[PDB]
Each structure stands twice: as structure tokens, then as C-alpha cells.
Scaffold this motif. Structure first.
Motif, PDB file in Angstrom:
ATOM      1  N   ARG A   1     -11.141  44.995  12.476  1.00  0.00           N
ATOM      2  CA  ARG A   1     -11.457  43.708  13.091  1.00  0.00           C
ATOM      3  C   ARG A   1     -12.931  43.481  13.337  1.00  0.00           C
ATOM      4  NH1 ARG A   1      -7.297  42.130  17.878  1.00  0.00           N
ATOM      5  NH2 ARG A   1      -8.891  40.487  17.987  1.00  0.00           N
ATOM      6  N   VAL A   2     -13.709  44.533  13.552  1.00  0.00           N
ATOM      7  CA  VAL A   2     -15.128  44.352  13.889  1.00  0.00           C
ATOM      8  C   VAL A   2     -16.038  44.743  12.731  1.00  0.00           C
ATOM      9  CG1 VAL A   2     -16.965  44.802  15.540  1.00  0.00           C
ATOM     10  CG2 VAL A   2     -14.575  44.832  16.295  1.00  0.00           C
ATOM     11  N   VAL A   3     -16.737  43.755  12.190  1.00  0.00           N
ATOM     12  CA  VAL A   3     -17.606  43.976  11.053  1.00  0.00           C
ATOM     13  C   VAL A   3     -18.976  44.401  11.552  1.00  0.00           C
ATOM     14  CG1 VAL A   3     -18.775  42.880   9.104  1.00  0.00           C
ATOM     15  CG2 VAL A   3     -16.364  42.394   9.569  1.00  0.00           C
TER      16      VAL A   3
ATOM     17  N   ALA B   1     -21.580  33.805  15.234  1.00  0.00           N
ATOM     18  CA  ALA B   1     -20.486  33.346  14.383  1.00  0.00           C
ATOM     19  C   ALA B   1     -19.455  32.477  15.132  1.00  0.00           C
ATOM     20  CB  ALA B   1     -19.793  34.536  13.725  1.00  0.00           C
ATOM     21  N   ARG B   2     -19.785  32.059  16.342  1.00  0.00           N
ATOM     22  CA  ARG B   2     -18.883  31.213  17.138  1.00  0.00           C
ATOM     23  C   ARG B   2     -18.582  29.861  16.511  1.00  0.00           C
ATOM     24  NH1 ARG B   2     -20.422  31.765  23.626  1.00  0.00           N
ATOM     25  NH2 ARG B   2     -19.848  33.981  23.774  1.00  0.00           N
TER      26      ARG B   2
ATOM     27  N   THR C   1     -25.509  36.575  21.195  1.00  0.00           N
ATOM     28  CA  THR C   1     -24.205  35.978  21.343  1.00  0.00           C
ATOM     29  C   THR C   1     -23.540  35.870  19.984  1.00  0.00           C
ATOM     30  OG1 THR C   1     -24.990  34.619  23.169  1.00  0.00           O
ATOM     31  CG2 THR C   1     -23.056  33.815  22.005  1.00  0.00           C
ATOM     32  N   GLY C   2     -22.225  36.035  19.960  1.00  0.00           N
ATOM     33  CA  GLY C   2     -21.427  35.674  18.784  1.00  0.00           C
ATOM     34  C   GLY C   2     -21.531  36.649  17.625  1.00  0.00           C
ATOM     35  N   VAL C   3     -21.835  37.910  17.910  1.00  0.00           N
ATOM     36  CA  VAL C   3     -21.939  38.931  16.880  1.00  0.00           C
ATOM     37  C   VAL C   3     -21.005  40.133  17.061  1.00  0.00           C
ATOM     38  CG1 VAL C   3     -24.291  38.194  16.427  1.00  0.00           C
ATOM     39  CG2 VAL C   3     -23.883  40.128  17.962  1.00  0.00           C
ATOM     40  N   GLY C   4     -20.027  40.042  17.973  1.00  0.00           N
ATOM     41  CA  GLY C   4     -18.967  41.043  18.030  1.00  0.00           C
ATOM     42  C   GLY C   4     -18.643  41.718  19.358  1.00  0.00           C
ATOM     43  N   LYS C   5     -19.361  41.376  20.424  1.00  0.00           N
ATOM     44  CA  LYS C   5     -19.191  42.081  21.710  1.00  0.00           C
ATOM     45  C   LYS C   5     -17.761  41.876  22.191  1.00  0.00           C
ATOM     46  CE  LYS C   5     -24.011  41.454  23.119  1.00  0.00           C
ATOM     47  NZ  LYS C   5     -24.861  40.913  24.205  1.00  0.00           N
ATOM     48  N   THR C   6     -17.363  40.620  22.333  1.00  0.00           N
ATOM     49  CA  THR C   6     -15.984  40.313  22.761  1.00  0.00           C
ATOM     50  C   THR C   6     -14.924  40.747  21.749  1.00  0.00           C
ATOM     51  OG1 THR C   6     -16.841  38.405  23.979  1.00  0.00           O
ATOM     52  CG2 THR C   6     -14.430  38.564  23.699  1.00  0.00           C
ATOM     53  N   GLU C   7     -15.179  40.522  20.461  1.00  0.00           N
ATOM     54  CA  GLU C   7     -14.240  40.976  19.441  1.00  0.00           C
ATOM     55  C   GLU C   7     -13.944  42.485  19.539  1.00  0.00           C
ATOM     56  OE1 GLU C   7     -12.656  38.779  17.825  1.00  0.00           O
ATOM     57  OE2 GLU C   7     -11.447  40.084  16.564  1.00  0.00           O
TER      58      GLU C   7
ATOM     59  N   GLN D   1     -11.448  35.666   8.993  1.00  0.00           N
ATOM     60  CA  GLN D   1     -11.051  34.391   9.587  1.00  0.00           C
ATOM     61  C   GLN D   1     -10.182  33.517   8.678  1.00  0.00           C
ATOM     62  OE1 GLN D   1     -11.708  33.188  13.013  1.00  0.00           O
ATOM     63  NE2 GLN D   1     -11.857  35.435  12.985  1.00  0.00           N
TER      64      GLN D   1
ATOM     65  N   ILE E   1     -16.603  38.432   7.489  1.00  0.00           N
ATOM     66  CA  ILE E   1     -15.972  37.790   8.643  1.00  0.00           C
ATOM     67  C   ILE E   1     -15.243  36.512   8.220  1.00  0.00           C
ATOM     68  CG2 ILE E   1     -16.425  36.587  10.806  1.00  0.00           C
ATOM     69  CD1 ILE E   1     -18.664  38.712  11.280  1.00  0.00           C
TER      70      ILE E   1
HETATM   71  N1  LIG Z   1     -19.006  41.723  14.332  1.00  0.00           N
HETATM   72  C1  LIG Z   1     -17.969  40.893  14.148  1.00  0.00           C
HETATM   73  N2  LIG Z   1     -16.867  41.251  13.482  1.00  0.00           N
HETATM   74  C2  LIG Z   1     -15.829  40.405  13.309  1.00  0.00           C
HETATM   75  N3  LIG Z   1     -15.787  39.161  13.798  1.00  0.00           N
HETATM   76  C3  LIG Z   1     -16.837  38.686  14.490  1.00  0.00           C
HETATM   77  C4  LIG Z   1     -18.001  39.538  14.717  1.00  0.00           C
HETATM   78  N4  LIG Z   1     -18.881  38.837  15.431  1.00  0.00           N
HETATM   79  C5  LIG Z   1     -18.333  37.626  15.634  1.00  0.00           C
HETATM   80  N5  LIG Z   1     -17.101  37.542  15.083  1.00  0.00           N
HETATM   81  C6  LIG Z   1     -16.186  36.383  15.036  1.00  0.00           C
HETATM   82  O1  LIG Z   1     -16.856  35.226  15.528  1.00  0.00           O
HETATM   83  C7  LIG Z   1     -16.500  35.065  16.899  1.00  0.00           C
HETATM   84  C8  LIG Z   1     -17.685  35.557  17.695  1.00  0.00           C
HETATM   85  O2  LIG Z   1     -17.575  34.981  18.929  1.00  0.00           O
HETATM   86  P1  LIG Z   1     -17.258  35.827  20.233  1.00  0.00           P
HETATM   87  O3  LIG Z   1     -16.211  36.880  20.051  1.00  0.00           O
HETATM   88  O4  LIG Z   1     -17.023  34.659  21.153  1.00  0.00           O
HETATM   89  O5  LIG Z   1     -18.695  36.521  20.477  1.00  0.00           O
HETATM   90  P2  LIG Z   1     -19.188  37.115  21.873  1.00  0.00           P
HETATM   91  O6  LIG Z   1     -18.971  38.576  21.703  1.00  0.00           O
HETATM   92  O7  LIG Z   1     -20.603  36.672  21.989  1.00  0.00           O
HETATM   93  O8  LIG Z   1     -18.298  36.500  22.945  1.00  0.00           O
HETATM   94  C9  LIG Z   1     -15.264  35.929  17.153  1.00  0.00           C
HETATM   95  O9  LIG Z   1     -14.196  35.153  17.677  1.00  0.00           O
HETATM   96  C10 LIG Z   1     -14.923  36.585  15.833  1.00  0.00           C
HETATM   97  O10 LIG Z   1     -13.879  35.940  15.091  1.00  0.00           O
END
Ligand SMILES: Nc1ncnc2c1ncn2[C@@H]1O[C@H](COP(=O)(O)OP(=O)(O)O)[C@@H](O)[C@H]1O
Length: 323
Positions: free
Chosen positions: A39-41, A279-280, A77-83, A243, A239
Motif C-alpha cells: 500500500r505504501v509506495v 498526492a491528495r 503533506t500527501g506523501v504517505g504518512k497517513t497511508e 488508486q 500510486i
Molecule cells: N507514499 C504513498 N504510497 C501510496 N499512496 C500514497 C502515498 N502518498 C500518498 N498516497 C495517496 O494519496 C493520498 C495522500 O494523502 P494522505 O494519506 O491524506 O496524506 P497525509 O499522510 O499527508 O495525510 C492517500 O490517500 C493515498 O491514496
């Protein structure tokens, strides 16, 4: 014996103990990184940091009265922390429901502590959530924004591996993983690049703001501080593929396949990523640029059950063809 599986026996033990199936089956562990990378690239450092901490805890090398692991995830932001937090909850503890997310921008103003551990007599979000799910990943976002009293409750979890709530009873955190995040420094970098500061000045300013918010006494408690990177063009392309998985899944139900030219994938990657938001934006780019005009094609019968659809770039955006 083939009829009763590992999962059958783990399921009974899980239901009776409260220990997640994947925790009980942890060993039957060396592959953790590969699983997380499904799941995490990219962000290899982050994944290895998380996996190393878990290995050290499993091998009996760490303090049993602290959480499994604790991290600070810096970078944009938007590079995988939450993912990664989500993916880790689903992997270690069988569901994303085992991820508890707390937005510190909602805990800036003093009385917010009550919101966490419970109002003073006369329960709390976090304490209740962790009581009922002791095996959880806890994601605190934008930690520098926490009110100091809120910040200190996090320090108690790190130091003690538990909290006492307002009812005066302990809530156990020894089976949690703690992930703290902050964007600090990232808008400053972009501001420097926009205003054309020298690398020197950009660097010095980033270090100043980090020193200002994060002191050694705090940082020393963490297993690791990891700086997430911006994503490369290739990583964004991978990614995009991830998606498109659910869409392909739904299309395959009608035996429709999707064949994207490289230009098509790059069209979505270019629109779905930027320095500010990472990537948000990608989800809604796909929705607007691909799923919507594909829906139209299907409803008009220009795309039919069984068809193999080439997706390419035309002048107005993506174009679709069937052989
Ligand atoms: N490193 C990653 N690997 C896979 N998917 C990613 C990655 N970074 C971002 N994404 C995708 O784009 C979105 C990034 O947004 P998000 O998870 O909201 O980032 P943040 O970690 O800043 O909250 C995710 O929902 C996911 O689908």
C-alpha cells in the motif's frame, strides 16, 4: 491436519482474549516491509523504521512498560504518512478501525485536555477509544499545534505506557504504536524557493523552526524521527495504479478492462500531485478525468460488457477507444 486452519484457532483465541488474529499469528514477521509496501509506495526509511521498532519489541529488547513504538514523521503533506499509519493498523491489527486519528489543530485551546482523557468530575475520546481497542495505531497529526497540557499527556503515554483517565482508572498503551506527524518546515521551504532564498538560508530557517518546537527531551523518547520525501514521478505513476485498483475491480465485474497508454498515466500523475498537497488531489482527478467520461461511454453503450478499453490523451483530456 488440513480441515482446521491456523486462522480458525487464532480466531477462537482472539475472540476469547481480545488479541488480534494477526498479532497472535505474527510469526507464522520478516515480510512486514513487503506487506506495508503493497500500500505504501516509496518512503522506504519510514517503513524500515517502523518494522525495525516492531522487530525489537517482538524480540524482547525494549521496555515492556512503553508502547510498541513511537515515531515522529516529518516532511510534506500527501506523501504517505497517513497511508502508512492506516496500512500498519490493517496489517498488525487486522483492520483500519485499529487506527485512532487525532488532529491536534482541534486541541490548541487549554480545555481540550478534557476532550482527551475526560472532563473533570462535576469519558475522554482517546482513553475510551484505547480502553476498547488496546491494540491500536495512534496517529497525532500536527503535534506542534497541541496545547502544552495536551502535549504532556502524550509524554505520559511515551514514559509510562498508560494513562489514568478522569474516572481515576488506568488505560493501557503498552500495545499501541504512536505516530506523531508534523508539516513543520515544508511551507518554509516552498516560501524560500518562491522568494529565491539561497539553500543556506532555507536550511538555516528550517532548523530554527524545528529547534523551536521540538526539544531533545521530547525527541529522545522516540524510536525514530523520519523525514518523508516528496514523491518521484515514477512513484506517483505507481500510486495512480494503486488508486485505479477498485475501479478496475468494478469494471472487471462486467469483464471490461482498461488499457492506459503511458501518456494517460502521466496525465493523471501530473494533475494528481503537487508540492503543497502531495498526492491528495489524485483521487478527484481520477474521478473527473477518467471515471466520469468512462461512465458516459458505458451509459451510451460505446463501452460494452467484455470490451477492452484503450485510454489515451487527446486534446481535451483523456480519450477512450475499443478494438
Ligand atoms: N507514499 C504513498 N504510497 C501510496 N499512496 C500514497 C502515498 N502518498 C500518498 N498516497 C495517496 O494519496 C493520498 C495522500 O494523502 P494522505 O494519506 O491524506 O496524506 P497525509 O499522510 O499527508 O495525510 C492517500 O490517500 C493515498 O491514496
Amino acid at each position: 491436519h488440513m480441515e482446521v486452519t491456523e486462522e480458525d484457532i487464532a480466531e477462537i483465541v482472539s475472540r476469547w482474549t481480545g488479541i488480534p488474529v494477526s498479532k497472535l499469528l505474527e510469526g507464522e514477521l520478516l515480510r512486514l516491509e513487503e506487506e506495508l509496501h503493497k500500500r505504501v509506495v516509496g518512503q522506504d526509511e519510514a517503513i524500515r523504521a517502523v518494522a525495525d521498532a516492531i522487530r525489537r519489541a517482538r524480540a524482547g529488547l525494549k521496555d515492556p512498560n512503553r508502547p510498541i513504538g513511537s515515531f515522529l514523521f516529518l516532511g510534506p503533506t500527501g506523501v504517505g504518512k497517513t497511508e502508512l499509519a492506516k496500512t500498519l493498523a490493517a496489517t498488525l491489527f487486522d483492520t483500519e478501525e485499529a487506527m485512532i486519528q487525532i488532529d491536534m489543530t482541534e486541541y490548541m485551546e487549554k480545555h481540550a485536555v478534557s476532550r482527551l482523557i475526560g472532563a473533570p468530575p462535576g469519558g475522554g475520546q482517546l482513553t475510551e477509544a484505547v480502553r476498547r481497542r488496546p491494540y491500536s495505531v495512534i496517529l497525532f497529526d500536527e503535534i506542534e499545534k497541541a496545547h502544552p497540557d495536551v502535549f504532556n499527556i502524550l509524554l505520559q503515554i511515551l514514559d509510562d505506557g498508560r494513562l489514568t483517565d478522569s474516572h481515576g482508572r488506568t488505560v493501557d498503551f503498552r500495545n499501541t504504536v504512536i505516530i506523531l506527524t508534523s508539516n513543520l518546515g515544508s511551507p518554509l521551504i516552498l516560501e524560500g524557493l518562491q522568494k529565491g532564498w539561497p539553500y543556506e538560508r532555507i536550511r538555516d530557517e528550517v532548523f530554527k523552526v524545528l529547534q523551536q518546537h521540538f526539544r531533545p527531551e521530547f525527541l529522545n523518547r522516540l524510536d525514530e524521527i523520519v523525514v518523508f520525501r516528496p514523491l518521484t514521478k515514477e512513484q506517483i505513476r505507481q500510486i495512480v495504479e494503486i488508486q485505479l485498483s477498485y475501479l478496475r475491480a468494478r469494471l472487471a465485474e462486467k469483464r471490461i478492462s482498461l488499457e492506459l497508454t503511458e501518456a494517460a498515466k502521466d496525465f493523471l500523475a501530473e494533475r494528481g500531485y503537487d508540492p503543497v498537497f502531495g498526492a491528495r488531489p489524485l483521487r478527484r482527478v481520477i474521478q473527473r478525468e477518467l471515471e466520469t467520461p468512462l461512465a458516459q461511454k458505458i451509459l451510451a453503450g460505446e463501452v460494452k460488457e467484455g470490451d477492452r478499453v484503450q485510454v489515451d490523451v487527446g486534446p481535451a483530456g483523456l480519450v477512450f477507444a475499443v478494438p
